[PDB]
Amino acid sequence: HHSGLVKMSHPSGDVEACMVQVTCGSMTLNGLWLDNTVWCPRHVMCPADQLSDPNYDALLISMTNHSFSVQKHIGAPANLRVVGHAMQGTLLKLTVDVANPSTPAYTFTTVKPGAAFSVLACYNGRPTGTFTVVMRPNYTIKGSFLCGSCGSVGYTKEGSVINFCYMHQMELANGTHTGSAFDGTMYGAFMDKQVHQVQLTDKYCSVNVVAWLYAAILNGCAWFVKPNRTSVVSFNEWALANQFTEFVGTQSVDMLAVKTGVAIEQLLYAIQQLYTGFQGKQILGSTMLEDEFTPEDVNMQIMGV
Amino acid sequence: HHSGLVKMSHPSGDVEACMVQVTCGSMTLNGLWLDNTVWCPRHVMCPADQLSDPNYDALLISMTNHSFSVQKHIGAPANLRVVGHAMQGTLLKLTVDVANPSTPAYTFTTVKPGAAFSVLACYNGRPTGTFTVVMRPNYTIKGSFLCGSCGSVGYTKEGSVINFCYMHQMELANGTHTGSAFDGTMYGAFMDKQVHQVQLTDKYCSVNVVAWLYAAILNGCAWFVKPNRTSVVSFNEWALANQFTEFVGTQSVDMLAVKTGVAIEQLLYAIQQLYTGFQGKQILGSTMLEDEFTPEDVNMQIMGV
Ligand SMILES: *[C@H](O)[C@H](C[C@@H]1CCNC1=O)NC(=O)[C@H](CC(C)C)NC(=O)OC[C@@H]1CCC(=O)N1Cc1cccc(Cl)c1
Ligand SMILES: *[C@H](O)[C@H](C[C@@H]1CCNC1=O)NC(=O)[C@H](CC(C)C)NC(=O)OC[C@@H]1CCC(=O)N1Cc1cccc(Cl)c1
Ligand SMILES: [Mg+2]
Ligand SMILES: [Mg+2]
Known about the structure:
Two copies of one chain form a homodimer. By secondary structure, chain A is of the alpha+beta class. Chain A has three domains: 1-16 and 105-202, Thrombin, subunit H (Beta Barrel); 17-104, Thrombin, subunit H; 203-305, main proteinase (3clpro) structure, domain 3 (Orthogonal Bundle), CATH 1.10.1840.10. Chain A contains seven helices and 13 strands. Chain A has helices at 13-16, 56-61, 206-218, 232-241, 251-260, 264-275, 295-301, and strands at residues 19-24, 27-34, 37-41, 68-72, 78-80, 82-88, 91-96, 106-108, 116-123, 126-134, 153-158, 161-171, 177-180.
């Protein structure tokens, strides 16, 4: 029995119309064109012989408006003249002489661990694929990015407003990925330098495991539900010793509790038991806990909220 | 260690610009507007009191051009006047008086079991999400569709050409989904009537399991590779008794064999052993065989082909 859950991304068209290619010297990557600004990773300025220890302040001062080439390829092709440049943290803000006529309503936000967002993967300013990820507790994502993908963007959508939350920068040794928010800060403790870096421990996202257990109940799969309960405070002490995030309830989780009649604390107890082993049973076709679906995913995809 | 694989859909913008809402009486669902034609499921003509045994021939003859309302909501809003109507299998072909100015280059094709395609889920003519599925051996997909989603479309893309392959029609009792190709045939033995239907057995897609094992090797995970080999003919006899599809090699699989230096027949042997149990080990974080990634997915996402 299929749960009705899939990895569901936002439709990408509004963001596709904002992707451009940015070239500086021998480096090329993607940028995001909104109004008269093009955002891109600052390492586009870095020659390959300096990627391990760039002096971005000196690289910035070495630039002229003539140093940057910006091109839009699809739909409404254009070469965009750069008329100013500035650095914000790990991003460049290029000012261009044409305002993007397809600029959507937008904001910039930071995404938190456990929350999902959609990514538009792009190469040479051309969108090639879209996928959804959850921000991990260690501020990486389990993405799919190759050389040339930097400047690919991640976003959520509220109504017609696009909330841009991620610009892709790097791949870590364990195959995960990280990038910057549009305030220019890297997620986590990462730096935009080509050196090996400490990656913090990942953890199971407890709130998302709870969501998935609710999805199981909504599909008639409830063998793991017992009268037994663990309080949020007690579960959270356990979580710290067992590589789980501390649980913080939300209205979205509460809606699942009301619909199913199963209390959060019943599922916190179930998690503690299931973490020790599923005893040969499956939940929604899985023999391990799943944390890649959010309470909102379950509310939207199964309950049609 | 993350494999670098995600469920990767095509960018959806070109298809978003083709989605419309179609209403006939009390029924509303989605349609696809290409050139001067709008395709939609024929059950838009059916009143709720007849969904279990519609007489579609009589329903069709009962229609006039005045029976259909077609509306485009996003981007370039429009009410489209219907000037003709016809039925092709389980689809209606409505002729409208305006050609869609955003019609992409396109073809219609049928997708085969094991192959992946992208879906644009829509409600009331408004795109709401995108996801990717593989056509199952029993001609269902494991999608995410609710009331109002019929007429949502699935497609692949070759260069700039969109190959439309699926129009959504129904949900089966086990939570999976099916629909029609654009020749109007339903996938499988299904009928577009609101009655319970025999669903054929699903099977593991052997070629996709092979692909995933190659993805594991490309990530340094090869504990399951031994000198032992099973021939394609021998594996295929085994597959018939063990709920696997028969294996048919392709150039895409051969590219993985060349890159890794591991023969297909080594992985056919591994599958037979792994099907009996993983012995407490994991492959790419999983304790069961994975068949939801294609050889092309692995070539593109990991090898950048
Ligand atoms: C931008 O297009 C790419 C995207 C990468 C390429 C492969 N997949 C991706 O997601 N980004 C990079 O190439 C960055 C650029 C720096 C300036 C941020 N480099 C990168 O990710 O490689 C270095 C990474 C940094 C963390 C780490 O562990 N790295 C490996 C490493 C460390 C030290 C030396 C070397 Cl040669 C590699
Ligand atoms: C179109 O928007 C919907 C999409 C569905 C709704 C829920 N999720 C979806 O994917 N399609 C339908 O409602 C179809 C319409 C018919 C005319 C094709 N109906 C449908 O899928 O429900 C009936 C299905 C058919 C196979 C089956 O097992 N069904 C259950 C069933 C059987 C007999 C009677 C009843 Cl009331 C339901
Ligand atoms: Mg990798
Ligand atoms: Mg369901």
